[PDB]
Structure formats: structure tokens, C-alpha cells
Write a protein that binds this ligand. Structure first.
Ligand code: HEM
Ligand code: HEM
Lengths: 137, 137
């Protein structure tokens, strides 16, 4: 289930983080404009960049903490507030998060690993609701 | 064959019981709703909870008794009736049991351990028929 999926991702986090982030950027290539130095690169070029794995792991490290602090896939309001107020997220709207979760759920459904993809879809919807409650446009 | 599989499973009943029950919940995550104390718990947290190990072993012990009393994977009607009339099963339907046997057979086919997975599938089919005959919806 969802709780065990957090443990599965944490046991191979850099690989899952990069693979899910690449699935996101490949499904929604214009989302590269929120980043720097990602356009014009294949997946293997991105994975050999100095910062790509490190930044994407830091993302997913915090995402798994937000998932782990949730109750029944409902995140803490304090975690949502942090994600709204982060300077790095000042250009974002809830739509950016909705696209991330579409891509993450599609990746889980296609994976050989037995993820509870429906719970991840609910967690993303509840996270988006919490971002809106915390004032993200 | 099927009789050796009962001996394999019995030899390490707690481990097989827990592994097959978690394979069931992983393939059909919605089924966790019938186990309210397992919601939101990692697999290692479940294995720390006395009743997870105890109840799951006792489930599979009874399954192995029913399997052993069967003739050519046809279970006794009396055994199907015990399962229908258990108060812990009062809100189940035959589809719950069908899903358990799909997951069990998948687990056996994926395992390194030899199993007569076709016999477990047919046992499950014949048990579901018997549960329906005994009045399960
Ligand atoms: C639940 C989802 C998310 C979490 C937990 C999260 C977390 C983080 C964290 C921890 C950082 C700091 C990375 C570092 O400095 O090394 C970061 C940076 C950033 N995040 Fe998010 N983020 C999420 C979703 C998003 C989404 C959906 C976007 C845009 C589509 C985005 C865009 C950015 C950008 C542009 C940065 C800074 C640039 C970069 O690290 O390359 N984030 N995020
Ligand atoms: C052939 C299949 C099955 C057998 C042999 C079986 C057997 C048992 C046994 C013996 C118990 C009592 C545990 C104890 O004394 O500690 C039990 C409880 C229970 N069973 Fe079943 N069961 C079967 C299938 C299922 C299925 C498919 C479900 C739900 C999807 C289910 C749900 C429950 C629940 C909720 C309880 C009570 C809580 C618990 O003890 O875990 N069982 N079962």
C-alpha cells in the first residue's frame, strides 16, 4: 500500500526520483522552462549533469517525508505551506503539481513494481487541495 | 505437487502466510479496508504487531487444513460452510476469495520455490464454487 510504497521508493530513491522526474519532463517538455540547463538534452545527458540527480533526490526526499507525515494520504498543512512559500517554487501554480502527479501515477501503473497507484493519485489530489488552501494560485 | 506444497507452506507457515497476504494486499490494495488496524502501516510495522502475525498464520493454517482435506483439489462443503459462517467473514463475497487466489497463484508462479500453481488455481476455483453453494454472495 501507500505506506510500504514510501519505503520502496526510499530504498532506491535516486533511481526512482530520476526516472519519475524524467517521465514528468518527457510527458510535459515545456515544464523544463521552470528549471535551468535541462533543454536540448536526452535522458542520459540529464542524468550525467552535475546537479540533476542531486536536486531531484532532494525533491523526492522531501516528497517522501510529506507522504510519510500524511494520514490516509492527507498531507500536513505545514508541509503544504512550506512547499508554497519555498523561494524555488515562487513561479509555480497548482497545475504544475497536478502534471507531476499525472506523470508519477502513470509511471507507477507502467512499472514492474506493485505500487498502490490509486493512493498516489489521491495523495496528489489532496496535496493540490492543501497547496490551494495554503494560498498557491 | 499440491500435497508437497502444503508441506512446503506448513514448514514455514508464518513466513508464507505473511508474504502471500501482503502479495494479496499489494495486488488488490482496496482489500486492506477489511483490516482496519493494518491501514497506514508499513510491512515491517505490520510484522511488529502481534495480531498481524497471529491472525494471518491462523488464516493460512485453516487454508492448509481445507487444502489437506480436499480430494483432487475439491474441498469439503463443510469446510466452505465454516468459512461462510465465520462472523469475521460476514461482509465478504466470493470476489474477495477469487482475488486472494489470483494473488496466491501469482505469488507461487513468481517464487524461486517450486509450487503446483495450476492446482492452487483449480483449488481456488472449486472453493469459490463451494462458498457460493454455501450461501456466500
Ligand atoms: C511534492 C512535490 C515537490 C516537492 C516535495 C518539491 C521539493 C523541492 C525541493 C526540496 C527543492 C530543493 C532542491 C535543491 O535545492 O536541491 C525543490 C526545488 C525546486 N522545485 Fe520543487 N518540489 C515539488 C514539486 C515541484 C514541481 C511540480 C515543480 C515544477 C514543475 C518544481 C520546481 C522546482 C524548482 C524550479 C526548483 C529549484 C530548481 C531546481 O532544484 O532545479 N517543484 N523542490
Ligand atoms: C480460504 C481463505 C481464507 C481462510 C482459510 C480464512 C481464515 C480465517 C481465519 C481462521 C480467521 C481467524 C483468525 C484468528 O483466529 O486469529 C480469519 C479472520 C479474518 N478473515 Fe479470513 N480467511 C480466508 C479468506 C479471507 C479473505 C479473502 C478475507 C478478506 C478479503 C478475509 C478476511 C478476514 C478478516 C477481516 C478477518 C478478521 C480479522 C483478522 O483476523 O485478520 N479472509 N480468516
Amino acid at each position: 500500500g501507500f505506506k510500504q510504497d514510501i519505503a520502496t521508493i526510499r530504498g532506491d530513491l535516486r533511481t526512482y526520483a530520476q526516472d519519475i522526474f524524467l517521465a514528468f519532463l518527457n510527458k510535459y517538455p515545456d515544464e523544463r522552462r521552470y528549471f535551468k540547463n535541462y533543454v536540448g538534452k536526452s535522458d542520459q545527458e540529464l542524468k550525467s549533469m552535475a546537479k540533476f540527480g542531486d536536486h531531484t533526490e532532494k525533491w523526492f526526499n522531501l516528497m517522501m517525508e510529506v507522504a510519510d507525515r500524511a494520514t490516509d494520504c492527507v498531507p500536513l498543512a505545514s508541509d503544504a505551506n512550506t512547499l508554497v512559500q519555498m523561494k524555488q517554487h515562487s513561479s509555480l501554480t497548482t497545475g504544475n503539481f497536478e502534471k507531476l502527479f499525472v506523470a508519477l501515477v502513470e509511471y507507477m501503473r507502467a512499472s514492474g513494481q506493485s505500487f498502490d497507484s490509486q493512493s498516489w493519485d489521491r495523495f496528489g489530489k489532496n496535496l493540490v487541495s492543501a497547496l490551494s488552501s495554503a494560498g498557491m494560485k
